[PDB]
Ligand binder design. Structure first.
Ligand code: L3J
Length: 371
């Protein structure tokens, strides 16, 4: 039955991944953003120039008003709405129907995207970061409590218009190769993890380990980029510039503002370095590494044109879609860990390969967590 959930994700580049859901009685079909960076389930419930359709509470016989307002601010965009509950199902997910908390979006600012094919968002993180507070039970918590669906889900995000898979309730072993490597979920709010080492083309950045998790490090499918804290970002860019010095770039490009183009099929992948992120492992003094290629952090946008998808953050490391793409990522809530493996959809490069490798020995990993 996991075969039914394979390829249930769609999306546009830089605009997130969505899954089809239905809410209310009779079922109203909506495309819902899959976001591990938040914990609120919300849908457009009023007309908007960017919305093809929206949740119509008056047409649902099972809708219940909670008579409470709610607003959620994201790093990009924000909305406010009215809380309520209704029946929810996932056509290409588990064959169950649950009553869940739903935020009916009545007002928003730069949240919905022009010509987007999604009209809502599914926050898959924990209750501690839910708005208005942690008493508003997130959807996946409701799903697990009301059904027998195991407390686990997997995301397979595939690059280029994009596609992928959200496996609800388990692991689909046909969707990845090699072994799964697990890092602990440090605390249950965001999906927080700990980065213990960073290498660019085999060379250690040699920064204090805390800098990598300054504030925090989270896994966020709702974010496009790999986002790095200021000090780490600057060190990374300086290194990537040095490796690709054979060409000079507009510099708007390194800030993600300007595109860069080459004649079709002539992109010089070889001049851009591979990046290895070492994550805390499951046993003492043990870590593992995930390696990403330039094909991942150079997002495609008639030449072949790209935008630099590594950007700066003031709120810690964000491992976004560029990082997740090419990998099978298991959000094992039951065992408080996140697993990584090479995806069945991986970008092919003739000379280099994205990888998940271990074990490695890394001493004093606890000192890497920010406090
Ligand atoms: C421009 C800001 C940074 N970047 C970025 C880009 C894009 C989105 C996001 C963030 C982004 O912030 N996404 C959120 C979830 N992640 C954040 C969050 O805010 N969590 C909420 C707190 C718990 C209260 C995380 C903590 O930063 C969901 C969401 C919301 C509107 C649209 C989309 C997804 C679809 C894709 C659009 C591109 S980027 C360019 O990739 O570096």
């Amino acid at each position: 039955s996991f075969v039914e959930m394979v390829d249930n994700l769609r999306g546009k580049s830089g605009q997130g991944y969505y899954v089809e859901m239905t809410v209310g009685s009779p079922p109203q079909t909506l495309n819902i953003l899959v976001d591990t960076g938040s914990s609120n389930f919300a849908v457009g419930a009023a007309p908007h120039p960017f919305l093809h359709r929206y949740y119509q509470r008056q047409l649902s016989s099972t809708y219940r008003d909670l008579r409470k307002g709610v607003y959620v601010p994201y790093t990009q965009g924000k909305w406010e709405g009215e809380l309520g509950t209704d029946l929810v199902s996932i056509p290409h997910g588990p064959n169950v129907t649950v009553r869940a908390n739903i935020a009916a979006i009545t007002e928003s600012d730069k949240f919905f995207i022009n010509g987007s094919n999604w009209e809502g968002i599914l926050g898959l993180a924990y209750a501690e970061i839910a708005r208005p507070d942690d008493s508003l039970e997130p959807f996946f918590d409701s799903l697990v409590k009301q059904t027998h669906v195991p407390n686990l889900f997997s995301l397979q995000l595939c690059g280029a218009s994009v596609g992928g898979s959200m496996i609800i309730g388990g692991i689909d072993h046909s969707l990845y190769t090699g072994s799964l490597w697990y890092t602990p979920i440090r605390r249950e709010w965001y999906y927080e993890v700990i980065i213990v080492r960073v290498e660019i083309n085999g060379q250690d950045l040699k920064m204090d380990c805390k800098e990598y998790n300054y504030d925090k490090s989270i896994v966020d499918s709702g974010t496009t980029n790999l986002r790095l804290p200021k000090k780490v970002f600057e060190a990374a860019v300086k290194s990537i510039k040095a490796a690709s010095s054979t060409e000079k770039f507009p510099d708007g490009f390194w800030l993600g503002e300007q595109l860069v183009c080459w004649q079709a099929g002539t992109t010089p992948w070889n001049i851009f370095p591979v990046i290895s992120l070492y994550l805390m492992g499951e046993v003492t003094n043990q870590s593992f590494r995930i390696t990403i290629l330039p094909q991942q952090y150079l997002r495609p946008v008639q030449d072949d044109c790209y935008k630099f998808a590594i950007s700066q953050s003031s709120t810690g490391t964000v491992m976004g879609a560029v990082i997740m793409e090419g990998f099978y990522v298991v959000f094992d809530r039951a065992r408080k860990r996140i697993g990584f493996a090479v995806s069945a959809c991986h970008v092919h490069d003739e000379f280099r390969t994205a990888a998940v490798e271990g074990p490695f020995v890394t001493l004093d990993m606890e000192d890497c967590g920010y406090n």
